[PDB]
């Protein structure tokens, strides 16, 4: 139950790992946002050029 215990170090390592994975999730989320922004801008461009034609 103390800090030196296997369970406490286990849960400390678990929270550290999930925080690193949360940083990775933030990276993937911003990449997703940028890619979606690009695709939606091109989709609006397609809509405008189809409206002209």
């Amino acid at each position: 139950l103390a800090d030196d215990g296997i369970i406490d170090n286990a849960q400390d390592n678990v929270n550290a790992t999930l925080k690193s994975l949360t940083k990775q999730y933030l990276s993937v989320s911003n990449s997703i946002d940028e890619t979606v922004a690009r695709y939606k801008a091109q989709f609006t461009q397609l809509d405008t050029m189809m409206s002209k034609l």
């Binding site: 993937v28 990449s31 997703i32 890619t35």
Partner: protein
């Protein structure tokens, strides 16, 4: 066959080495799993980005 104490010592050593092998295999497939997961997520991120 006398001297059972050394045989008990051998049995407990066998238990300890089975524990060690179990942990070795555990971390072995943990490394394999994290490597394949990294490969999968890298592939999907590269595919979506480009």
């Amino acid at each position: 066959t006398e001297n059972p104490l050394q045989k008990i010592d051998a049995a407990l050593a066998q238990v300890d080495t089975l524990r060690s092998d179990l942990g070795a295999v555990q971390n072995r497939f943990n490394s394999a799993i994290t490597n394949l997961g990294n490969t999968v997520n890298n592939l999907t991120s590269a595919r979506s980005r480009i």
